[PDB]
Amino acid sequence: LNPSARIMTFYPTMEEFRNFSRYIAYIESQGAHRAGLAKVVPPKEWKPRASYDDIDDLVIPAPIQQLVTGQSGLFTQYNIQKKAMTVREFRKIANSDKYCTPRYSEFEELERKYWKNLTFNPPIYGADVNGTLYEKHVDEWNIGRLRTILDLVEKESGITIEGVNTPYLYFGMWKTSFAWHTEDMDLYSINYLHFGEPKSWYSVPPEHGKRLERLAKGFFPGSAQSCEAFLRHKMTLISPLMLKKYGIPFDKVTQEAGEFMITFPYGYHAGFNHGFNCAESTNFATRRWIEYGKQAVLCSCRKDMVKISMDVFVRKFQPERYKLWKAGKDNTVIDHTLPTPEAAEFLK
Ligand SMILES: O=C(O)c1ccnc2c(O)cccc12
Ligand SMILES: [Cl-]
Ligand code: NI
Ligand SMILES: [Zn+2]
């Protein structure tokens, strides 16, 4: 299904919305994953928090200034870590005249304005903020406790990886952006926009991901030579025109507050924020992810980079292949079109 591999949008009834893992299996049964990105707007009823009128005092330990360098569709973004500041301090700076959002009509306007000025007046981003905004009593899509097989990591080793198996908060500003990248260990990803201005996304189908990396290695040969997966550095930005110019299939979508965004294994994505906003995210997994995790090409030039031991997952879900795998003979090939095993129920 979804032979065009286009970004899909889902409107779940409060009944379908209850079980996270199930609905994920459902959208995968509808081919949503073939796009790499999918949108899911919660039932008109559901709300994760009562009011965001208290966060103004919340602190951002390390906001970053985004310096972008480049021309004609290709840019490298550098990070200048700033001094701690509150959401209030941030909102004032984000709303000031200098970092304010430009006036526009159609989205295609803000888009061209973005790719035209991303190298000027470097903005601030309140990213990687350890925390959650969900109310401890919410049992639907709580980024703090999704209850997926990714919990196996902490259960078996006690290991915690901030932002991956724990929630991260991102306070946006106009022109703040996220470079092209797949999730760490090529995991799944969930992003919820609590409030504020929109956040636009660009996505490349997992079945075409390799083409995007070939293009990236060609434009950034130096970075490519220094690292087997420099794109994981999240410093590379590439405009849509540049992708079109080289036949790279991709889709666009805008995430407004109260909506969910789901990225799938090996799905390349990128985008930028329209203005001041808050977003919460974390990674998660399904049985299907295991193979992706086993084959994930990781960063080889940085100590920091995330690396999960697949051992425990292969043992529990791929016992017949464990021995062959530890011997390096598991030559399984991945079919990015196949839905996760758990979707069987919705395929009868
Ligand atoms: O900055 C974002 O809003 C964002 C969107 C999608 N994925 C992200 C990520 O994987 C790491 C940090 C930020 C993002
Ligand atoms: Cl280079
Ligand atoms: Ni991401
Ligand atoms: Zn690297």
UniProtKB/Swiss-Prot annotation:
Result when mutating H181A: Abolishes histone demethylase activity without affecting ability to bind H4K20me2
Species this chain originates from = Homo sapiens (Human)
Q: What is this protein's function per UniProt?
A: Histone demethylase that specifically demethylates 'Lys-9' and 'Lys-36' residues of histone H3, thereby playing a central role in histone code. Does not demethylate histone H3 'Lys-4', H3 'Lys-27' nor H4 'Lys-20'. Demethylates trimethylated H3 'Lys-9' and H3 'Lys-36' residue, while it has no activity on mono- and dimethylated residues. Demethylation of Lys residue generates formaldehyde and succinate. Participates in transcriptional repression of ASCL2 and E2F-responsive promoters via the recruitment of histone deacetylases and NCOR1, respectively.
What does the entry state regarding organ or tissue expression? Ubiquitous.
Q: What is the effect of changing G158A?
A: Abolishes histone demethylase activity
Reproduce the free-text note on domains from the UniProt record: The 2 Tudor domains recognize and bind methylated histone H3 'Lys-4' residue (H3K4me). Double Tudor domain has an interdigitated structure and the unusual fold is required for its ability to bind methylated histone tails. Trimethylated H3 'Lys-4' (H3K4me3) is bound in a cage of 3 aromatic residues, 2 of which are from the Tudor domain 2, while the binding specificity is determined by side-chain interactions involving residues from the Tudor domain 1. The Tudor domains are also able to bind trimethylated histone H3 'Lys-9' (H3K9me3), di- and trimethylated H4 'Lys-20' (H4K20me2 and H4K20me3).
- Residues that, per the record, bind 2-oxoglutarate: Y125, N191, K199, K234
Subcellular location(s) of the protein: Nucleus
Q: How is it modified after translation?
A: Ubiquitinated by RNF8 and RNF168 following DNA damage, leading to its degradation. Degradation promotes accessibility of H4K20me2 mark for DNA repair protein TP53BP1, which is then recruited. Also ubiquitinated by the SCF(FBXO22) complex; leading to proteasomal degradation.
For the JmjN domain, which residue ranges apply? 7-49
The record's family statement is: Belongs to the JHDM3 histone demethylase family.
Note the superkingdom of the native organism: Eukaryota
Please tell me where Fe cation binds in this chain.
H181, E183, H269
Identify the coding gene: KDM4A
Quaternary context? Interacts with histone deacetylase proteins HDAC1, HDAC2 and HDAC3. Interacts with RB and NCOR1. Interacts with VRK1. Interacts with FBXO22; this interaction promotes KDM4A ubiquitination. (Microbial infection) Interacts with HTLV-1 Tax protein.
All residue ranges annotated as the JmjC domain in the record: 135-301
**Effect on the protein upon substituting G131A:** Abolishes histone demethylase activity
Annotated positions binding Zn(2+): C227, H233, C299, C301
What does the record give as the organism's lineage? Eukaryota, Metazoa, Chordata, Craniata, Vertebrata
- The molecule here is called Lysine-specific demethylase 4A
